[PDB]
Amino acid sequence: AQSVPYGVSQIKAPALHSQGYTGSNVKVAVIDSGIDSSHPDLKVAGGASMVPSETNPFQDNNSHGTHVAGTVAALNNSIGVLGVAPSASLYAVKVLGADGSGQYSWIINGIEWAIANNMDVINMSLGGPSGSAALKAAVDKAVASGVVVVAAAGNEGTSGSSSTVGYPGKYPSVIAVGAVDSSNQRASFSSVGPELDVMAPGVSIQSTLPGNKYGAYNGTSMASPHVAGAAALILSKHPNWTNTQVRSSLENTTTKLGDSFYYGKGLINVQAAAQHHHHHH
């Protein structure tokens, strides 16, 4: 039997599933450590590797990209977990190696591959404390080209009054996502600052792991793909909506939580996002 992880329910993805919308024909790039395409609860549609010493994007030597991918799009069937957008066209864009790290040029090459291959959504469950002009240019170009770009806010927690959101989440063109638990409480590690946009579940998130396994991971890495999957659900219901409109719909229909410094606009609600008229619940 299949299980629905709590975070998929918490963002109200099942409401969209019951309307008949599951992310069909929406192309989502998971820009990450690869995706294990042999997992029976995932279907990988394509991809490419920008990691010079690890050339197969369908081999995930870290495990992280595979977990992120299952939150986006684990298959709707009688096994494992269910993804937010279980019919999405999933692309493994490998820019991180076995040790979980990549050079800025690898991430940029991956964002460029996504643009050239007409991806509708990019998820980047990744980040660093500094930006670069070339990184900002790549994400700005993807957004100018019509892609919804979503990234983890970072796991730096608080630092008095300073923002601790990392890059590329910290760029205005990117939706920066923080983490809450099942009670809607901010996770203590979740980055903070005026760049934090929305929150999603990022504590004890069950998903797919390489070698036909499943497991619970924590992180703003886990929160980001709830929002990327939500964007794919919204686009499957409104295939002409622009990335501007998809982003606004998610921002404008959050459930407001605490102060925006710690919670941004609050928890995403994809049911409300995918209606024509938007307001907060």
């Binding site: 991180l96 979980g100 790290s101 990549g102 660093g128």
Partner: protein, 63 residues
Amino acid sequence: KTEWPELVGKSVEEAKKVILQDKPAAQIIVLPVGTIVTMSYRIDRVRLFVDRLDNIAQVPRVG
């Protein structure tokens, strides 16, 4: 203890020694400063970001 700001500017060797005294079960991973990394949070992990000379270039923390 979950952050070691006193280790910035020290050798990677001394940082590993100190962190393992405070957290003997730590899974330490050494990475180049200025790379991009996954945003999972792992309480058992301590990443050490080094400059090209193998000195600590960012405050080590659990995660």
